[PDB]
Ligand binder design. Structure first.
Ligand SMILES: Nc1ncnc2c1ncn2[C@@H]1O[C@H](COP(=O)(O)OP(=O)(O)O)[C@@H](O)[C@H]1O
Ligand SMILES: Nc1ncnc2c1ncn2[C@@H]1O[C@H](COP(=O)(O)OP(=O)(O)O)[C@@H](O)[C@H]1O
Ligand SMILES: [Mg+2]
Ligand SMILES: [Mg+2]
Lengths: 438, 440
């Protein structure tokens, strides 16, 4: 309430400062910029306050980013970074740029030398992120490691050896369980847990409250993140159980504002008597908007209903797509194009979570699909796509339709978010069923 | 070889010493005996050498035992105790008294205050053992805890709080996994791992090293016992995989000699062509010896063959019994009576492992089955049983028949051991198939 305000206003000013250092940093040469880290390390080494070089450090990361990726951190992203450095939960909507916002607090912390642990929901994302978030990090003179399941102890010492590490909550935890069952300390792959930046905190710290089972026993990984000196998370959904975050991990939730006004239209739930009445009113809806030239993603609670709705959808003569959270790699390729004017995708709970759905398709997947990277063909794609885009927009952007509400609204909010991002005009609808009286 | 000898001879002398202190300790009053622990604690507290009060400490445990249970530790048992205090694997045959031999090294170690972890193959045994091994321990002024699966954290702090604790390898391990996923140290149920005495070491440290699957992750409790300051084990089969014990846990195997000469007769494997030829030659064999008045246990590799042989055995008109390692508690009650002159039992891999099969039945289960514990009726059982006993013996004691050899001889040796214990005359037979005898 007035608390979220005073706290946002609080650092909102520190944000203004960062923007003031922009004309300066804009001048420092590449070598002078890169070497900005040495200075920060010395400064800190001299015992200077951690949270003291935040405005200056964040100003650097923005600059490097703008130079390496050509992406200037939105001040709202800076706002988010700051929250991520305080044992807070920065809530930022889907499409807001959490992936890049983390380079900020991950850079500030990756200076002391203790390492930084960015957590993700799955292996594909963890590596994917590290992969294309690395150039910014290698520029600023840091090393990025990727921790995965089948990595021999040697490799894992490497991935945890870097200044910045990426992995999934499980593997990190599993490594910790395995390090305790270690022969000799020199056989351990981790180090003293320092800072953990959790991407999709709710998913990781709340839904993953469902114990794993050893077979016969069962344990949880709840407390694993409480062993970290610094624990911080980010998500596009947190205010729901915003109380549980502090009752366990003592994490204060800060709802960051969006960059561009959120104009997506969340339509009222239409209730039907039978499952058939539902699935039929939706295939009738997609089939409709389809012609209109508007893309539409469908969400299902489980593969179960996902399969069923898939056939009922192909039966009405409709070429759709299905993602069951099995092949993240490939699903991701597909979800990244569900923004094409004529596109229908059926995703499950954690189907293509993590891939930004650009209105009108993603031309980058188009250019990366041409052995001949010439500034000529790209133009007839970066401008060709541009057409499909504004077209899809005029057509009300992306429309998602929940086949059913989850036990937790938070969950069936993650679905909505896949739409109307970075200011995009889109819409969402939920189709409930009376027959769901179970 | 000459190594096992020099090492056995080595402590064999320390054994002689223990026997010399017997006439002395025999005089100390109950209170003076019990208070023998205080002295040991003080002595050690004064910084005296651990392995220095072994001959004296073991002499005490024998005395207390002789008094509380009325069981004087065989010197060979004392031999075993010693081995169990050195990061060794004391190999002692089935029926040799491992359960009581552990009170020795478990007492020596349960003095420093760090606790002692006796490991068993299953929950039933772990509690069963603590239960009726306690009186000796409470006498000598020590507390005994029992760690089990559904015990709330509170309870578990208790069981690990005692001087001596009993549980299964898994639960101990599981506790350790759960202690690492603890909120705050004050939420942990274990203490720093000190001494672990593994009963049935091969089973626990070799067969069990099969990796539990987290659900996805794969880890092994192989290293769990390597975190213990002191690791020691005991079994009636270790000499086989004696090399793997040191290549992982660095444990030297010591083959302790038996109390009474081992006269059981292990007969040659009879190979048959078909499974029917097998199961038929065995039901023909048990049906035979049955009449003779000799009991016979059958071992199967899995419940699979166990069920099959059970029907084929009842089909020939034979009242038998079956244990599938499901209800340890009950099976145990039954295995303890498979020594009755006319008894047929079909057990699986880990069916009634742990229960000593007395020739002629177990009268103790008979006396404990009478609300009226009078010195009168017991006599007509302790002397009545005595008849069945010598009778079963003359009939060649217990005869076990393996329905099929296991991948590891060690395993199908555990079967044999269920017979001919403490000197008993018995016999064992293995019935293989042709599509096996082709060992090539
Ligand atoms: N500061 C920025 N400037 C320009 N584009 C950005 C910026 N930050 C993020 N993006 C783009 O917007 C999308 C939103 O990023 P994403 O990683 O999917 O974050 P989130 O998890 O919040 O949805 C990305 O695909 C990225 O290409
Ligand atoms: N010192 C002893 N004096 C008398 N009986 C003993 C002694 N030690 C062991 N026994 C008996 O011999 C049997 C062997 O015990 P058990 O627990 O089955 O050990 P093991 O693991 O060697 O088979 C027990 O039933 C017990 O009654
Ligand atoms: Mg993301
Ligand atoms: Mg035993």
């Amino acid at each position: 309430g007035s608390r979220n305000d005073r706290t946002l206003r609080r650092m909102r000013k520190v944000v203004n400062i960062i923007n003031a250092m922009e004309p300066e940093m804009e001048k420092l040469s590449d070598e002078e910029l890169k070497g900005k880290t040495a200075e920060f390390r010395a400064r800190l080494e001299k015992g200077e306050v951690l949270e003291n070089l935040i405005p200056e450090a964040f100003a650097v990361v923005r600059e490097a980013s703008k130079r390496v990726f050509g992406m200037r951190h939105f001040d709202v992203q800076l706002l988010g970074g700051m929250v991520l450095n305080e044992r807070c939960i920065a809530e930022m909507r889907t499409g807001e740029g959490k992936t890049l916002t983390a380079t900020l607090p991950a850079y500030l912390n990756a200076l002391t030398g203790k390492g930084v642990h960015v957590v993700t929901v799955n292996d594909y994302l963890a590596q994917r992120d590290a992969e294309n978030n690395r150039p910014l990090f290698e520029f600023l003179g840091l090393t990025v490691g990727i921790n995965l399941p089948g990595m021999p102890a040697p490799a894992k010492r490497e991935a945890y050896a870097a200044d910045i590490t990426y992995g999934t909550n499980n593997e990190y935890g599993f490594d910790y369980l395995r390090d305790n069952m270690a022969f000799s300390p020199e056989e351990r792959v981790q180090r003293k847990l320092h800072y953990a930046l959790v991407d999709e905190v709710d998913s990781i710290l709340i839904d993953e409250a469902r114990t794993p089972l050893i077979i016969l026993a069962s344990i949880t990984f709840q407390n694993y993140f409480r062993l970290y000196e610094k624990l911080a998370g980010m998500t596009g959904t947190a205010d729901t159980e915003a109380f549980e975050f502090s009752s366990i991990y003592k994490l204060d939730t800060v709802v960051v504002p969006t960059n561009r006004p959120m104009i997506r239209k969340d339509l009222p739930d239409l209730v039907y008597m039978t499952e058939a009445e539902k699935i039929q009113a939706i295939i009738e809806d997609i089939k409709e908007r389809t012609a209109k030239g508007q893309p539409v993603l469908v969400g299902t609670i489980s593969i179960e209903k996902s399969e069923l709705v898939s056939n009922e959808l192909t039966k009405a003569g409709i070429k759709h797509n299905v993602l069951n959270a099995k092949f993240h790699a490939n699903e991701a390729a597909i979800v990244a194009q569900a923004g094409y004017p004529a596109a229908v995708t059926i995703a499950t709970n954690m189907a293509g979570r993590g891939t930004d759905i650009v209105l009108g398709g993603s031309w980058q997947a188009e250019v990366a699909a041409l052995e001949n990277p010439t500034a000529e063909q790209i133009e007839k794609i970066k401008a060709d796509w541009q057409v499909r885009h504004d077209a899809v927009l005029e057509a009300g952007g992306l429309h998602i339709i929940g086949t059913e509400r989850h036990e937790s609204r938070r969950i069936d909010n993650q679905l909505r978010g896949r739409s109307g991002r970075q200011g995009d005009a889109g819409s969402s609808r939920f189709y409930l069923s009376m027959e769901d009286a179970l």
